[PDB]
Design a protein around this ligand. Structure first.
Ligand SMILES: O=C(Nc1ccc(F)cc1)C1(C(=O)Nc2ccc(Oc3ccnc4cc(OCCN5CCOCC5)ncc34)c(F)c2)CC1
Length: 290
């Protein structure tokens, strides 16, 4: 029972342009994908004009009493609405209901998030497969960078993986907390994925997304190891400034580690673009038979 009239009117039209009628969406409330402090995610079924059922994920707020939270939640969906790329998560629409939270509707991702997938010892991606996942993230980021979109929380935990093992760059946003508390430290910042200059200024750019991408590559090559496990979250700046980087994973090819070190260049301006990363990683990927 939100009052649409209290919201920013630009925001509300934007939402109406991607609206899903409540009768077209069935939320399976008994089938919870995750719960957090601010939000939760359910399995859902979306019907289109022909009655074709689409399996989706349905994101909700836990409270609708704060106009800032509601506005922020809707704004997260609107930020997404024009992302149209095979390696970026898309928005199915937003469902405004007479009572309760508005609902953000996402295509269902069979294999959940990338970090949990590569940590699952019941799948066995090859080194080539893992580099391929990295290449897909780079392609999604090349697309987002071309739109001048800065991600700010690129990490394996925020990338999704569908039934075809296509990686979709995403951001759990208000539902980041469902899992993954410890990696965010006081606004809660993902400090072990952050560029040196962001640690110092809390400002983010495409070049700091590149630093994060370097850490994501390290996550891939270690099959989801936590970075800097021995370092207190509040001390990562001191640690890096001693002259340190993440070590080369055992099965990380030398040229890929060189790419990681480029992503962590002390000068943001000198880090490779995502266009360059796509080119470089495409070449490294191609040297593997399987
Ligand atoms: O992603 C977002 N924005 C965004 C930002 C930057 C960008 F580049 C792209 C999108 C926003 C967002 O809310 N994203 C989001 C991403 C994943 C979300 O969670 C899921 C979506 C689709 N399928 C899912 C599937 C899933 O698990 C599937 C079942 N698992 C599978 C693995 O093993 C156990 C069972 N878990 C969460 C899913 C979600 F509810 C919201 C803030 C809007």
């Amino acid at each position: 029972h939100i009052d649409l009239s209290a919201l920013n009117p630009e925001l509300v039209q934007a939402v109406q342009h991607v609206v899903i009628g409540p009768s077209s969406l069935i939320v399976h409330f008994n089938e919870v994908i995750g719960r957090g402090h601010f939000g939760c995610v359910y399995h859902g079924t979306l019907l289109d004009n022909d009655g074709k059922k689409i399996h989706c994920a349905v994101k909700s707020l836990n409270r609708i009493t704060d106009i800032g939270e509601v506005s922020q939640f809707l704004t997260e969906g609107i930020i997404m609405k024009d992302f149209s790329h095979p390696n970026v998560l898309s928005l199915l629409g937003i469902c405004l209901r007479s009572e309760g939270s508005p609902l953000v509707v996402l295509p269902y991702m069979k294999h959940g998030d990338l970090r949990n997938f590569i940590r699952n010892e019941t799948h066995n991606p090859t080194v080539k497969d893992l580099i391929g996942f990295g290449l897909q993230v780079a392609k999604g980021m090349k697309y987002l960078a071309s739109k001048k979109f800065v991600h700010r929380d690129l990490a394996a935990r925020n990338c999704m993986l569908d039934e075809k093992f296509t990686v979709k760059v995403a951001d759990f946003g208000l539902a980041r907390d469902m899992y993954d508390k410890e990696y965010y430290s006081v606004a809660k910042l993902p400090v072990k994925w952050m560029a040196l200059e962001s640690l110092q200024t809390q400002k983010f750019t495409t070049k700091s997304d590149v630093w994060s991408f370097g850490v994501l590559l390290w996550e891939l090559m270690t099959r989801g190891a936590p970075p800097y496990p021995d370092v207190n979250t509040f001390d990562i700046t001191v640690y890096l400034l001693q002259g340190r980087r993440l070590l080369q994973p055992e099965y990380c090819p030398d040229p890929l580690y060189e790419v990681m070190l480029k992503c962590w260049h002390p000068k943001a301006e000198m880090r490779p673009s995502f266009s360059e990363l796509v080119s470089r990683i495409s070449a490294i990927f191609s040297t593997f038979i399987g």
